[PDB]
Amino acid sequence: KKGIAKEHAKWGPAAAIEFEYDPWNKLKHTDYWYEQDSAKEWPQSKNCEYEDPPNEGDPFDYKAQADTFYMNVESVGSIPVDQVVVRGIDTLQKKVASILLALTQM
Amino acid sequence: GSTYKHDRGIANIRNNIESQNLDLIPHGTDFVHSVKKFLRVRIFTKIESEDDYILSGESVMDRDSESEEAETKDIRKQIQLLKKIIFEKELMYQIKKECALLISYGVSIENENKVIIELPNEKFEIELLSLDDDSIVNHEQDLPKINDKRANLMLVMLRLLLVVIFKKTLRSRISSPHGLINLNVDDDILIIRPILGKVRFANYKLLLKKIIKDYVLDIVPGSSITETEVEREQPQENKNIDDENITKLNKEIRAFDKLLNIPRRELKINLPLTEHKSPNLSLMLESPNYCNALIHIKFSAGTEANAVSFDVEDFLHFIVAEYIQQKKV
Amino acid sequence: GKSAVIFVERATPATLTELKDALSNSILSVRDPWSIDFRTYRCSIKNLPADVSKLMYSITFHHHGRQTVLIKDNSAMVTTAAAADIPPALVFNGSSTGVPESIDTILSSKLSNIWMQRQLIKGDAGETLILDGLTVRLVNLFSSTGFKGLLIELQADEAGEFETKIAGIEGHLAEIRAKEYKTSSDSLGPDTSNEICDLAYQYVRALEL
Amino acid sequence: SNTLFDDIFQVSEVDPGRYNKVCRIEAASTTQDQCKLTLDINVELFPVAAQDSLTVTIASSLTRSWRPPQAGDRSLADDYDYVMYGTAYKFEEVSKDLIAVYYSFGGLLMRLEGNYRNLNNLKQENAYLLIRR
Amino acid sequence: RNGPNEHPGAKYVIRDSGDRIDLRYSKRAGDIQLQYGWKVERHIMDNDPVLFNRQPSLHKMSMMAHRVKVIPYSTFRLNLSVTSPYNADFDGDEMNLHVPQSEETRAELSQLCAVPLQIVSPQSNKPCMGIVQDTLCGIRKLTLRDTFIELDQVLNMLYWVPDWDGVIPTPAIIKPKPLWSGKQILSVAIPNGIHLQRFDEGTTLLSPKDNGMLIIDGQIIFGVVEKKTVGSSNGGLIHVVTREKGPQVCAKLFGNIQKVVNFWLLHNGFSTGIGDTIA
Amino acid sequence: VQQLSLFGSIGDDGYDLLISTLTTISGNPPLLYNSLCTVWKPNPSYDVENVNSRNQLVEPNRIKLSKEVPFSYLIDETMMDKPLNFRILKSFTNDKIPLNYAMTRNILHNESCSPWSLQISDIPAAGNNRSVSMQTIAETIILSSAGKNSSVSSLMNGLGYVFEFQYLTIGVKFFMKHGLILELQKIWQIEEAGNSQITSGGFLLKAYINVSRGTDIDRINYTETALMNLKKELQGYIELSVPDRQSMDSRVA
Amino acid sequence: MNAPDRFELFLLGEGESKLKIDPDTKAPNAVVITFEKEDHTLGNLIRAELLNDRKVLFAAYKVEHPFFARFKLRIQTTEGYDPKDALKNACNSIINKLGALKTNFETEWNLQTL
Ligand SMILES: [Mg+2]
């Protein structure tokens, strides 16, 4: 039968979804736990290469906001990888439309 | 049967003179009454050939006599006094008609007296003060007068008209569960008494007369034009075999209907027509409570059809002028 | 009085307005809202074999009076739940208490053993569009399972050439991209001493699939 | 509705004892010798080093809820670089004509020691702190 | 009509006659027409007073009156701050529930032994319930000078307080960038009129180490909130609140402090690892 | 609807008097009326459980179709003629009007059908001693019919019912205070093998009030009172009492 | 055993609207929309978009308890602006943003040869 992962995880078309942003902690969204040096102690992300290192001789960008997200969508088989992304975009779109429509009936 | 409401009844006891005293449980005892008010009436006309604004009246008088008998030891004479009592209760009905006036713009002055009166030829018809109706004390001479004869016709009508009310009340009562109690909501039921007589006389008639002068604005063509009870025929039939829900119910419904002509009295309306490749038009006068609508129609029947219908007297004059152009000429 | 019913199976809430405007020119006046309740009673009877039928449809109109038509195997019964709509004579001699309720209420609550309410479609805040010699009603139909489709009701005084009136409206449907729709004026056969019942009835033809 | 204090101080010391984003600053007025200042500042937002000359202002205004934007068209009463809002919590009589007032900007503490502003500073929830340079 | 199987339903009808009607089997369970004075034995419903107890029961606080809240899943759920009086944990503990049967009995529970009444105990003339675990841990973290919250989160943190005036407090930092402190947004849970002063070792009116406590008109001026402030302490924020505002007000404060703190910590996160034992 | 009621009876002997009396008490004349009732039972060929899709214990019951017969289909002699119902009832005693009532069930004398009062009642309210008979009634009005099989009999069969038995009742009713009705009545069994008067000997007396509420204990309690007052006022002339419940149960039986 | 049905998370109850809009008493031009059979997925999304609206003064959402799939969203706007309209616009903006996201992904995917 047709179903969604909310009812049962068997209807989950996606395996793990990788999700990261700001590989250099420019946003100060985490306070790195350390023993001597947080830079030496914590492994550098792959995505560090796709962003500019902060350069110490600069003040903290408070105005700065989170855009640019490095993701990896893994399929189980049921739906092709692309369609996990597309159908995901579409479901969320439909989900929002329902609210607009609900307001409309009200 | 049927409900005026306040202070209504009779109460009766015997004196040592072997006569019966009639108590009322108010209306205070006086063996076959003490002091009595009959309903009375009175109609004035102010003409003078439009000279000095001189008004006279004339009043249809109800006096069986001033001499009273209702003999002691005689309930048969007391039965007569009981009939008198009925008449006194009937005047209480004219108090309801007083109230039913309060819904109109024709005379009620100071809240202390109300005078029945209407504009045309300035005339006045009937009276009885918001204080009361007909209270007895006068000299007696006999002369009549044209106004007086007409005025006796009023009383019986106005009187009659609220026997109608006294009847359509009982229709509802006999007919459906709750009962009728509490009298004339919307002053729709109330208004009938004295309201529709005033309307009737005045309105439809004066307005019809005025419409006829406007139809003299169509007096121009050789023409022809006729009036019927035709609107009247089309609705509100009189004494019909049809009935209602029941045999018992049907009878009373039927009784209502023929008297119902009088109560219904909106203007009938009329029409005019031409032949020779033939055209046709028509108009209906409707009183809604002494306010007058004139709604008209017109069709010029020919090989291919053309037509218009319209439903204020200013526009009617104008419509007639436009009709002259689209008529023959 | 003649009539026809059109059901747009494949539709959304908006489909109504699309057609509403495609007719925005061809209007005269718009009167007060109407409503309709459409019930499906599955019969509870197994003793009667598959050789003869089952199922009864119950159509409640809010056409001024809370009147309800029942339909089973092309036979239609007309009831009212409105106290005012009772034949006067029934009330007088005591036949009626004057306290009616909906025939459906009775069905579901008193004869529920014989009849089970299977489906309940309602049409709320319908719109009344008035033309010359053709009154056109429109409403969105909702189930307890979501939107069901759009409904068009066609009532006309003019026994004259109702056939053209129907065809014209089906045209407007092609324009707004209304594809896979269902239509009924009955099936040449029933007779009308009370036509309204039959018209109200057709709905069933349009909503049976 | 108006200003309550204005002077330019010079920072002697900046202290982040265990605190990563905040610093207690020690300053003295360049004008009045009697005047000194202790203040906790969000140094991650507006950095401060020693010997910096800073204009420090008070003012009771520029009540009810707080509104975020529209400030583009609204008159930004800040000709200053860093602004705070806090409450006056103590009025220390530090001898002579000398007074000291304590301000808490939601935990960020401040102590101003002087004399003259008897006819200015009050025990009010309303007190802004403006800093430029 | 709902009957014995539906959730707000009933099991029996007790007639004047004395005989019990079983709604589960009575052929008249549908067409049952009630009469004044009869008794309907109905299900326990949200807000009924009930006796809750954790055995042993060496305390009057080991048996307290709670408001029912019918919920799904097979466990009795309790507010975390009420853990201590019962001496309960969730390592596999079971608890007892007793239901009063009279209007009189119910009154006894609600009017004498209800949880808010039991907050300040006569055992040691101090509060016997305080802020614990996540909420205690998160409360320190939230109330450091370092701790500043952006507008987005401030709005959620505010809305989370069920009695919030609707008033967005003026940020402690207005430009560059509006920022609120932990102290500030926690103070929204602290009711007006609440006055508290505490001096810990080295506390000055300038509290350099963010030592002790200073709450004026139910607004924190200085110091970090922890065990001494928000725990089941003699001088406690709780001791003052129960005493000054009422038991019903203080009971609300528990929920309030936790709804803010737990929400904040949900998003801040907190962990513990081997790295924390390493020196 | 809730029907609170009291019952009793008088021999034809007492009628004349009772009438004169009842007219004075009520202040309205008695009004002549009649009605036929046709009772239907579930088709005994079909068979069904006593439970719903909403697990509810639901019992099989009879349906009652009721309506007026215009007297033209009922009366034996014009000579009697007249409008008076009581003197006329002696004319009616022991035996039947035309009847053969089947005819009307399926039209006759190509056809649609009349209006009916379609009712189903429950046993009167369980009660250890009730001052009054309190009974629930489910009703709908049938307005007319449509379709292939539009005769009332076809309709009832379509719904799964079967004709059980029928009766005519003729009487006078008094319209009275606060919805109180008094019917003085006679009942006739109608079968195909001839008609007999169930009430032969006298009149069934029924004093009642139909109440819209049920769930307004107050108007219900007011209604009890009304009926009580009546029974009471006429006490020592005629006892109005509550019929045995068991005797008012239209169930399967 | 005391476990609720899994569809209860997404499938609307018997007579239960998706939205219930109630007005906030404590503040002028403020409203409270309760979203039934919804979670963070939608709440945080809407809240964040209303934050982008300049004429929106207050916006926050909360899932009052995790056993129930519903959330209360509180919207406060400047006088004259309607919060229902604010919600309507943020809803629209989201859709239009997602529409572009899909279009952009589709274009980029078609370019790949794997
Ligand atoms: Mg344990």
Swiss-Prot record, chain B:
- Where is the protein situated, by its record's location annotation? Nucleus
The protein's superkingdom reads Eukaryota
Function, in words:
Component of the Mediator complex, a coactivator involved in the regulated transcription of nearly all RNA polymerase II-dependent genes. Mediator functions as a bridge to convey information from gene-specific regulatory proteins to the basal RNA polymerase II transcription machinery. The Mediator complex, having a compact conformation in its free form, is recruited to promoters by direct interactions with regulatory proteins and serves for the assembly of a functional preinitiation complex with RNA polymerase II and the general transcription factors.
Subunit and partners: Component of the Mediator complex, which is composed of at least 21 subunits that form three structurally distinct submodules. The Mediator head module contains MED6, MED8, MED11, SRB4/MED17, SRB5/MED18, ROX3/MED19, SRB2/MED20 and SRB6/MED22, the middle module contains MED1, MED4, NUT1/MED5, MED7, CSE2/MED9, NUT2/MED10, SRB7/MED21 and SOH1/MED31, and the tail module contains MED2, PGD1/MED3, RGR1/MED14, GAL11/MED15 and SIN4/MED16. The head and the middle modules interact directly with RNA polymerase II, whereas the elongated tail module interacts with gene-specific regulatory proteins.
* Membership in a protein family: Belongs to the Mediator complex subunit 17 family.
Q: Which residues of the parent protein does this chain contain? A: 345 to 687 of 687
UniProtKB/Swiss-Prot annotation, chain D:
Q: Name one GO biological process term.
A: transcription by RNA polymerase III
Entry keyword set: Acetylation, DNA-binding, DNA-directed RNA polymerase, Nucleus, Phosphoprotein, Ribosome biogenesis, Transcription
Entry GO CC: nucleoplasm; nucleus; RNA polymerase I complex; RNA polymerase II, core complex; RNA polymerase III complex
Enumerate the InterPro entries for this protein. Answer: NA-bd_OB-fold (IPR012340), RPABC3 (IPR005570)
Which of the residues bear the PTM N-acetylserine? 1
One Pfam family hit: RNA_pol_Rpb8
Region feature Non-specific ssDNA binding, mapped onto this chain: 15-38
Question: What are the subcellular locations of this protein?
Answer: Nucleus
UniProt GO MF annotations? DNA binding; DNA-directed RNA polymerase activity
Task: State if Magnesium is listed as a keyword.
Answer: no
Oligomeric form and interacting partners: Component of the RNA polymerase I (Pol I), RNA polymerase II (Pol II) and RNA polymerase III (Pol III) complexes. Component of the RNA polymerase I (Pol I) complex consisting of 14 subunits: RPA135, RPA190, RPC40, RPA14, RPB5, RPO26, RPA43, RPB8, RPA12, RPB10, RPC19, RPC10, RPA49 and RPA34. The complex is composed of a horseshoe-shaped core containing ten subunits (RPA135, RPA190, RPB5, RPO26, RPB8, RPB10, RPC10, RPA12, RPC19 and RPC40) where RPA135 and RPA190 form the DNA-binding cleft.
Q: What does this protein do?
A: DNA-dependent RNA polymerases catalyze the transcription. of DNA into RNA using the four ribonucleoside triphosphates as substrates. Common component of RNA polymerases I, II and III which synthesize ribosomal RNA precursors, mRNA precursors and many functional non-coding RNAs, and small RNAs, such as 5S rRNA and tRNAs, respectively.
Curated annotation (Swiss-Prot), chain E:
Q: Describe its PTM?
A: The tandem 7 residues repeats in the C-terminal domain (CTD) can be highly phosphorylated. The phosphorylation activates Pol II. Phosphorylation occurs mainly at residues 'Ser-2' and 'Ser-5' of the heptapeptide repeat. The phosphorylated form of Pol II appears to carry, on average, one phosphate per repeat. The phosphorylation state is believed to result from the balanced action of site-specific CTD kinases and phosphatases, and a 'CTD code' that specifies the position of Pol II within the transcription cycle has been proposed.
Q: Where in the cell is it found?
A: Nucleus
> Which residues are involved in binding Mg(2+) 1?
89, 91, 93
Provide the binding site for Mg(2+) 2: 89, 91
Give the note. Mutagenesis experiments demonstrate that the minimum viable CTD contains eight consensus Y-S-P-T-S-P-[A-S-N-G] heptapeptide repeats. Identical and simultaneous substitutions in a number of consecutive repeats are lethal: 'Ser-2' -> 'Ala-2' (14 repeats), 'Ser-5' -> 'Ala-5' (15 repeats), '2-Ser-Pro-Thr-Ser-5'-> '2-Ala-Pro-Thr-Ala-5' (10 repeats), 'Ser-2'-> 'Glu-2' (15 repeats), 'Ser-5' -> 'Glu-5' (12 repeats), '2-Ser-Pro-3' -> '2-Pro-Ser-3' (15 repeats) and 'Tyr-1' -> 'Phe-1' (12 repeats).
Question: What family does the Swiss-Prot or TrEMBL record give for this protein?
Answer: Belongs to the RNA polymerase beta' chain family.
Q: What is this protein called?
A: DNA-directed RNA polymerase II subunit RPB1
UniProtKB/Swiss-Prot annotation, chain G:
- The answer to whether the entry has keyword Chaperone is no
- Its predominant location is nucleus
This molecule's function is given as: DNA-dependent RNA polymerase catalyzes the transcription of DNA into RNA using the four ribonucleoside triphosphates as substrates. Component of RNA polymerase II which synthesizes mRNA precursors and many functional non-coding RNAs. Pol II is the central component of the basal RNA polymerase II transcription machinery. It is composed of mobile elements that move relative to each other. RPB11 is part of the core element with the central large cleft. Seems to be involved transcript termination.
| More about this protein | Present with 4280 molecules/cell in log phase SD medium.
> Could you tell me where this protein is found in the cell?
Nucleus
Protein name listed in UniProt: DNA-directed RNA polymerase II subunit RPB11
Q: What's the reported outcome of changing residue 111 to P?
A: Transcript termination readthrough
GO BP field:
RNA-templated transcription; termination of RNA polymerase II transcription; transcription by RNA polymerase II; transcription elongation by RNA polymerase II; transcription initiation at RNA polymerase II promoter
Oligomer status and interactors: Component of the RNA polymerase II (Pol II) complex consisting of 12 subunits.
The species this protein belongs to is: Saccharomyces cerevisiae (strain ATCC 204508 / S288c) (Baker's yeast)
Q: Which GO terms describe its cellular component?
A: nucleus; RNA polymerase II, core complex
* Pfam families, per database record: RNA_pol_L_2 (PF13656)
**What is the gene called?**
RPB11
Key words, A-Z: DNA-directed RNA polymerase, Nucleus, Transcription
Q: Which InterPro entries match?
A: RBP11, RBP11-like, RBP11-like_dimer, RNA_pol_Rpb11_13-16kDa_CS, Rpo11-like
